[PDB]
Design a protein around this ligand. Structure first.
Ligand SMILES: CCCCCNC(=O)[C@H](Cc1ccc(OC(C(=O)O)C(=O)O)cc1)NC(=O)N[C@@H](Cc1ccccc1)C(=O)O
Length: 297
């Protein structure tokens, strides 16, 4: 049981030791294409790269590389694309990936600037009347509307392939309150957001994989995907107590390195899965509880 494990670890002050063990047991796979000198300007951080076996390939003639990985969770029957926050020169590639992979939703877990430092490029339009054109990948992006809440904003974007004139509606789910240091005090806001993303239809199997990112696409993004997958498994096994969060995280780590960046994010992932479990288990009023607890106004 994850609840019993959570407490044993918590009371013995062993989060750092459990996290250290996950880092040590994690898979090691080649990072070859990401390290090619030609791709240096496509990586935000030199120590965060997609493995060759699961990297997303752009359907680009000259260079198919993007720092993004396909996390294919077999048992949970869900796939996620985790990528770094796009750089000024990779915003076109980012939207190209979204188009090619047929993604319906984009989940952003950070702010463009945090503690005075740039963490992600301004890749979507902030004003309806000032659309963005990505010349390199021949894409047009327009802000259609935006619903700003106290801890997240949901935007309706229109992505157009200028080559075929085909148009698609992309939903942008932006968590705007991750703390400058550490992790949120409570997982209520994070869970309300996760369920808003589920409710939108963006994680459905009829669409391509949701695109999730933070700055490196491994810590906050890993937290979001780990919690979602754990919750899916708990609803699928129907005996949620067999879900081993450490084992789920290690399967996810076969697809992208360093998912879950600190012991505090691991602890927070347990907290979010344990609390989300209360809804999955049957509490029909707990979703309203997070709605209020997260104080969306
Ligand atoms: C798990 C591997 C990461 C280990 C520590 N690295 C760093 O913090 C960063 C990479 C990094 C990893 C996770 C992060 O997550 C947070 C976020 O996305 O906001 C979050 O989840 O809140 C943010 C950054 N790397 C550099 O800062 N890289 C620098 C310094 C550096 C130079 C040479 C070698 C390694 C690092 C660079 O120039 O690329």
């Amino acid at each position: 049981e994850m609840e019993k494990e959570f407490e044993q670890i918590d009371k013995s002050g062993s989060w750092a030791a459990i996290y250290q063990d996950i880092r040590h047991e994690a898979s090691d796979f080649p990072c070859r294409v990401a390290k090619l000198p030609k791709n240096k300007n496509r990586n935000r951080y030199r120590d965060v790269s997609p493995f060759d076996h699961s990297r997303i390939k752009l359907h680009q003639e000259d260079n198919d590389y993007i720092n993004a990985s396909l996390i294919k969770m077999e048992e949970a029957q869900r796939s996620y694309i985790l990528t770094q926050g796009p750089l000024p020169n990779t915003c076109g590639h980012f939207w190209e990936m979204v188009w090619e992979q047929k993604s319906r939703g984009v989940v952003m877990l950070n702010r463009v600037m945090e503690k005075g430092s740039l963490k992600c490029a301004q890749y979507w339009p902030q004003k309806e009347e000032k659309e963005m054109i990505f010349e390199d990948t021949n894409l047009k992006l327009t802000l259609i509307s935006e619903d700003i809440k106290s801890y997240y904003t949901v935007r309706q974007l229109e992505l157009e392939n200028l080559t075929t004139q085909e148009t698609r509606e992309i939903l942008h789910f932006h968590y705007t309150t991750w703390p400058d240091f550490g992790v949120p005090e409570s997982p209520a806001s994070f869970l309300n957001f996760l369920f808003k993303v589920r409710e939108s239809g963006s994680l459905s199997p009829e669409h391509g994989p949701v695109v999730v990112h933070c700055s490196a696409g491994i810590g906050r993004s890993g937290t979001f995907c780990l919690a979602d997958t754990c919750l899916l498994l708990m609803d699928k096994r129907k005996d949620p107590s067999s879900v081993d969060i450490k084992k789920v995280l290690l399967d996810m780590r076969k697809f992208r390195m360093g998912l879950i960046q600190t012991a505090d994010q691991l602890r927070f992932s347990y907290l979010a899965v344990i609390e989300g479990a209360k809804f999955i288990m049957g509490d029909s009023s707990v979703q309203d509880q997070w709605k209020e607890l997260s104080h969306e106004d």
